[PDB]
Paper text:
DSBs can be repaired through the nonhomologous end-joining pathway (NHEJ), which processes and ligates DNA ends efficiently to prevent or minimize sequence loss. Polymerase λ (Polλ), one of the Family X polymerases, fills sequence gaps of DSB substrates with a strict specificity for a base-paired primer terminus. In addition, we present multiple crystal structures of Polλ in synapsis with varying biologically relevant DSB end configurations, revealing how key structural features and hydrogen bonding networks work in concert to stabilize these tenuous, potentially cytotoxic DNA lesions during NHEJ.
The electron density for the active site in molecule B was slightly clearer than for molecule A and was therefore used for structural analysis. The active site of this pre-catalytic complex contains the nonhydrolyzable dUMPNPP bound in the nascent base pair binding site, along with two metals (Na+ in metal A site, Mg2+ in metal B site). Superposition of the DSB.A and SSB complexes reveals global comparability (RMSD of 0.63 Å over 286 Cα atoms), though distinct differences are observed. Surprisingly, the template strand is shifted slightly from its position in the SSB complex. The templating base in the nascent base pair binding site (K7) and its immediate downstream neighbor (K6) occupy a very similar position, while the template strand upstream of the break site is rotated approximately 3 Å outward from its canonical position on the palm subdomain. In the DSB.A complex, the upstream template strand is rotated slightly outward from the palm subdomain and there is a concomitant shift of Loop1. Lys544 assumes an extended conformation and lies within hydrogen-bonding distance of the nonbridging phosphate oxygens between template nucleotides K6 and K7. The ‘thumb loop’ is often disordered in Polλ structures, but is ordered in both molecules within the asymmetric unit of the DSB.A pre-catalytic quaternary complex and adopts the same conformation in each, which differs from that observed in other previously reported structures (PDB ID code 2PFO18, gray). Within the current lattice, the two ‘thumb loops’ are in close contact—mediated by a disulfide bond between the Cys543 sidechains—and interact with the DNA substrate. In the current study, the ‘thumb loop’ is ordered only in the DSB.A complex and makes contacts only with DNA template strands from other molecules in the asymmetric unit.
Author numbering: 237 to 575
Write the structure that this text describes.
Amino acid sequence: DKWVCAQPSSQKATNHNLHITEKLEVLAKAYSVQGDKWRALGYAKAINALKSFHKPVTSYQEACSIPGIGKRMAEKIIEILESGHLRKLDHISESVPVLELFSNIWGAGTKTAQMWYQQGFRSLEDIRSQASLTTQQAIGLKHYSDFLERMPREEATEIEQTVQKAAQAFNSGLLCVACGSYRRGKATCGDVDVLITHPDGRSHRGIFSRLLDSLRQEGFLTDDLVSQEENGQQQKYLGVCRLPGPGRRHRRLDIIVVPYSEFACALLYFTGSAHFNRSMRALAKTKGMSLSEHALSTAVVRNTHGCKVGPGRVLPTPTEKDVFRLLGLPYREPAERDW
DNA sequence: CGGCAGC
DNA sequence: CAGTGC
DNA sequence: GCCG
DNA sequence: ACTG
Ligand SMILES: O=c1ccn([C@H]2C[C@H](O)[C@@H](COP(=O)(O)NP(=O)(O)OP(=O)(O)O)O2)c(=O)[nH]1
Ligand SMILES: [K+]
Ligand SMILES: [K+]
Ligand SMILES: [K+]
Ligand SMILES: [Mg+2]
Ligand code: NA
Ligand code: NA
């Protein structure tokens, strides 16, 4: 089947092609930090296909039979399979490790990394001492090492509980759901994602700013990166937190507050994975629908030229299950969405 | 060849 | 608008 | 990078 | 989607 959102990610639990995917991931990451996002996307999808496959790939013909693998990818797969190496890795530009270093700063992407490299910068100390930094990038740089680590799941638990307890002190009826990789059951988490709503349809209002102010006053929030406080029905905070007590590190924290009617689509989005979401949204589009963090809708409205001019009509979805049902997809628990 | 999710 | 991110 |  |  061609659609990862129609398949359980536990197919990847035994990677029969580890020898191959480890090499391809180096090349994929090189393309990614150079800004070749669509080539890197094609690699990411081929790597998932190899991880998912039910046995070691043993021939070029078999490789080409797998959705997501074409002639070029099959050539590399078979070189690695039969020689143990991928010669193309030997020819990656010496700039790539530096571009990776620079784009590991939160708020600096490929264009900023390229610019710094062209200015002659090569190290994080060069950046700190000489580079022009946005407000977000200066936070990302000062927390560079803390943010590159994935935290143990146990620490993510303490963080999501800190947020939940602070929110429920304002209204005990709030639902506070840890999402992202935490909800998908992972043993380590790049950050903590928290979704908040209230089943009465109204009492989520106002909680966002009260909650951030409370967590700031206790010293739990240490830096803010992005705030969407007033635009529409959903509110979003991206920032930095730190648990109390000795030796604790700074961690990225994302919070979203949504009305109850959008809870299912916000939960589905924020649980991810990102590749799962992109697959499910592309599938919705082929079925004459549109899927976002706000709703599952009928197809967006377009004009004579093909240009989107307005939203489609919302289809009510009380639960995550309803989105899957309306798309004709087998339901997947969060841990099975880890694409 | 152009599109690759939707905010 | 370009860059960046979830 | 792959797909259609 | 915000940021600038
Ligand atoms: O490009 C994206 C990125 C994220 N998302 C959604 C799915 C993802 O699970 C969720 C949270 O984003 P994170 O960057 O926190 N990723 P995740 O929590 O899955 O993994 P990590 O352990 O790296 O945070 O937002 C997208 O839809 N598109
Ligand atoms: K497998
Ligand atoms: K194929
Ligand atoms: K990065
Ligand atoms: Mg996360
Ligand atoms: Na970055
Ligand atoms: Na996040």
